[PDB]
Amino acid sequence: PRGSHMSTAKTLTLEMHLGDLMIGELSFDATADTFAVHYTKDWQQSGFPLSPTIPLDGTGTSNQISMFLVNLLPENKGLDYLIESLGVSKGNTFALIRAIGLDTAGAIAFVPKGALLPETQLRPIKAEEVIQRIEDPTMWPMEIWDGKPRLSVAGVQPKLNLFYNGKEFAFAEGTLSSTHIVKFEKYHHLVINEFITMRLAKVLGMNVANVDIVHFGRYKALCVERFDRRNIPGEQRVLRRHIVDSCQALGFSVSKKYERNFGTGRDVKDIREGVSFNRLFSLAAKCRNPVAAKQDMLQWALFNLLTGNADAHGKNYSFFMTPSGMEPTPWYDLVSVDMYEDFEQQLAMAIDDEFDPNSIYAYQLAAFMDGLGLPRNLLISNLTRIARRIPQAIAEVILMLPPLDEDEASFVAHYKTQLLARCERYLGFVDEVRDVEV
Ligand SMILES: Nc1ncnc2c1ncn2[C@@H]1O[C@H](COP(=O)(O)OP(=O)(O)NP(=O)(O)O)[C@@H](O)[C@H]1O
Ligand SMILES: [Mg+2]
Ligand SMILES: [Mg+2]
Numbered sequence: 001p002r003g004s005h006m007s008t009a010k011t012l013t014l015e016m017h018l019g020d021l022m023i024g025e026l027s028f029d030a031t032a033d034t035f036a037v038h039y040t041k042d043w044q045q046s047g048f049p050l051s052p053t054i055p056l057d058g059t060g061t062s063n064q065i066s067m068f069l070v071n072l073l074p075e076n077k078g079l080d081y082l083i084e085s086l087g088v089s090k091g092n093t094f095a096l097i098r099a100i101g102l103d104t105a106g107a108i109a110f111v112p113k114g115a116l117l118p119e120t121q122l123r124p125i126k127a128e129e130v131i132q133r134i135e136d137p138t139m140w141p142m143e144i145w146d147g148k149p150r151l152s153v154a155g156v157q158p159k160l161n162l163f164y165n166g167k168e169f170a171f172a173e174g175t176l177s178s179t180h181i182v183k184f185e186k187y188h189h190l191v192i193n194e195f196i197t198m199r200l201a202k203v204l205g206m207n208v209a210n211v212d213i214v215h216f217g218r219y220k221a222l223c224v225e226r227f228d229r230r231n232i233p234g235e236q237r238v239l240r241r242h243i244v245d246s247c248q249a250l251g252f253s254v255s256k257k258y259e260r261n262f263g264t265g266r267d268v269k270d271i272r273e274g275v276s277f278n279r280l281f282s283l284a285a286k287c288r289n290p291v292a293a294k295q296d297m298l299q300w301a302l303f304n305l306l307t308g309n310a311d312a313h314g315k316n317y318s319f320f321m322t323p324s325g326m327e328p329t330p331w332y333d334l335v336s337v338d339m340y341e342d343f344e345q346q347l348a349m350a351i352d353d354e355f356d357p358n359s360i361y362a363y364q365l366a367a368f369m370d371g372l373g374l375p376r377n378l379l380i381s382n383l384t385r386i387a388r389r390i391p392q393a394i395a396e397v398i399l400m401l402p403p404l405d406e407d408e409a410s411f412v413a414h415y416k417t418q419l420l421a422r423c424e425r426y427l428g429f430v431d432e433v434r435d436v437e438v
């Protein structure tokens, strides 16, 4: 270079790339301990911001940038392995983003200024390599391969984000990126649970991510196709689409993923500063089609009630970012959490101030809709329709299952029993909703 040769001229700036296009810079001021994000003039006129709170005019606050970036980070053991591998402090978000920057959720690659990219290639994986990690997580952490941490998506469950074309898995490197998220079970029948729940949404005609069960030896894992990615058929190139989760969209910390953001503790049960339904629905205004977005959110809420998904928190709903506004993404992380009866559950987001799923009746649903300023008939029609279609849908989904052992078949039987019971419960009072005096 003809200018400054100080290391910091390169190391304090991560360029922001969308494919082969540089759209701006994420800079970190050492002295102030702050982040900043500025975009190119072409991108300001033509593109979209990283999130609604990191605007194209470049005035995004350090704190909003920081929380946005933290929301991109792993939430499981993968985070600790990453920190350890780099030798950095926990709060050094900049270094962590540098580390995972070539493949984060969404479409933006964070690339060190004036540095040579790692070689663009694949690192193929053998089933046996996954198996030793399933069987001995202590000797063989799932997240470390060839001595390097690999996880660059969020969520608490063990997983890998991988490249995949229907036969073999690999790590993407350089300009290539992962296309799938493979989720491993640490609880019984969790893969089957999520497979059924996700396929049920699909059969019902919902907008939902594609999932397969895959096998590593005897072990099942859930392979989820990423909707922030499209592998171009006929060549080695993965296009990206930018997304943000609802925390990011609201400018909230990862700590606010649950509405009760300080937890289940009864001393904090009325501290409800996290993502709530009212807050989630407020984001519809930023969407290309606000009414359609609210309908999707409502269908999501109802589907989650009917399937017993008590973990539908703010990081489990996302939006595409586009030049014309946000668009809700296909659904993901749909699980019948209700099936785990060694755990007493609360809804992630309350309905009419009610967090106990078992205490949702017609009153709560009517109050919910009134408080969202939506007509009750929209809930009545959708709830009735989904609940009535579920008996056929679940029959269809069960045909999609691979060979089951006895314990697995019994799980599926119980899943179905409980599912049909929730449907019948809600159908039992849905026609009251109209007449409720809230
Ligand atoms: N199909 C998908 N396409 C794109 N991004 C996805 C997809 N599925 C998941 N993600 C992203 O990956 C993250 C983790 O996936 P998720 O299925 O939610 O795992 P999880 O471990 O079960 N999360 P949680 O239980 O809520 O702590 C999500 O928060 C999204 O940011
Ligand atoms: Mg999740
Ligand atoms: Mg989950």
Ligand code: NA
Pocket (backbone or CB within 6 Å): 310, 311, 312, 345, 346, 347, 348
């Ligand atoms: Na919950």
